[PDB]
Symmetry: D2
Subunit: 114 residues, 4 copies
């Protein structure tokens, strides 16, 4: 099943933050309405934040996270969680190799902001 | 129900990151085995990542997130989600006012790291 | 924070199922548009399905779950999770006593159906 | 990533319930310790419970859900959610066709029971 794709409410600001846990350099691309709106790159085996940004979901509200490591897309796992029917988390884990810890690049999308 | 309390596997590194979205100055305290292990604070209505740190769950694996704003504990909401039976996110939202967006201080705990 | 309240898409069919795990007889009320649309009662310490129905979210999409034992409201905990940006689960747990297992009445709402 | 596989606490009772939403007859196999522990079969386009049972996670605590329609394995999506650090839901969605509503066979695993 498709992972890393989320439908947010339209024209809504949301935060996107990426963490790295891998010997491999992580490149995280955040697409909004099918266009790259943010790119974070970094290498850490210590959950370092390799990037954070606030984006607008645009008219489509379509947000997609892609993670690439050593020239190959990482396998993605994701889910959206909603707390108290108001607070949203779009979560992404990714696996760049074979140990399947899926934390190589961890991406958290959260909204609403403000 | 109690919120903001999570049982992690013992002696396990986890990341804890806080985001602020409120005119109110947020103060986030992270307790491990009931002892403060990290404290973050900030004032942003634009999802500033006011703090991130790597902690160890210790022998108890007990982790608790507390949030206060100008001397008042905020109301918390939380849940834990596990993806592909490997990646864990312990999520916390908090409300310091009356609009109930519960994003005033948002805390994300993730493990495993590395 | 308010729990057991979910905003589903309007006029959408959804399933609501309740399980009991308590010495006490559970009463589960499912409210749509603030009106009781389904009610289940029963006692089991073996996860019996005391009720499962398909209801339509109506024009507002507002769905609320209430759990009480012989008239005494139980404490609720809830969250919503969406898988592959399509499959929705609204989850409710409830505590009617002191042990805090919050499984006295467990309610799961899922959509889309069909 | 693998889906439908969950690690429950060892030797713990849990409930597993399957709902069907498809013209195809759904077969859900629940394995514990990699051995079939339960199997449900039914057809419904109205979220009917095609099976519900209480099982024990056994020594490994490993529980896997597999879904097949017409002898073909459905694609699965899943996640585990924990509320108030006590109540667990291991959720599974499955797709037997091309519309990708992933609700053809929905399986809900919950614990603790009692
Ligand atoms: C292939 C890519 C995932 C990373 C790539 N790794 C490598 O070239 C070599 C060969 C496999 C193990 N490896 C490594 O450098 C190290 C070995 C420790 N392991 C990995 O790269 C696997 C990656 O990094 C590890 C620290 C863990 O975080 C794994 O979960 C992660 O997938 C790199 N740039 O360092
Ligand atoms: C109400 C009033 N308090 C205030 O006006 C205080 C003074 C500083 C800004 N402020 C406020 O009430 C300000 C405006 N609003 C808040 O503090 C609510 C908070 O900040 C907002 C920007 C949003 O992020 C809210 O979700 C958040 O709870 C009073 N005490 O009568
Ligand atoms: Ca890895
Ligand atoms: Ca890793
Ligand atoms: Ca607020
Ligand atoms: Ca706010
Ligand atoms: Ca109880
Ligand atoms: Ca109970
Ligand atoms: Ca389908
Ligand atoms: Ca279907």
């Amino acid at each position: 099943a498709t992972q890393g794709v989320f439908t947010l409410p339209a024209n809504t600001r949301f935060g996107v933050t990426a963490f790295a846990n891998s010997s491999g350099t992580q490149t995280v691309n955040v697409l909004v309405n099918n266009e790259t709106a943010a790119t974070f790159s970094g290498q850490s085996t210590n959950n370092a934040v390799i990037g954070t940004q606030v984006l607008n979901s645009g008219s489509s509200g379509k947000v997609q996270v892609q993670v690439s490591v050593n020239g190959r897309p990482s396998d993605l796992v994701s889910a959206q969680v909603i707390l108290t029917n108001e607070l949203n988390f779009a979560l992404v884990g990714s696996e760049d190799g074979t140990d399947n810890d899926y934390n190589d690049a961890v991406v958290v999308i959260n909204w609403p902001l403000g």
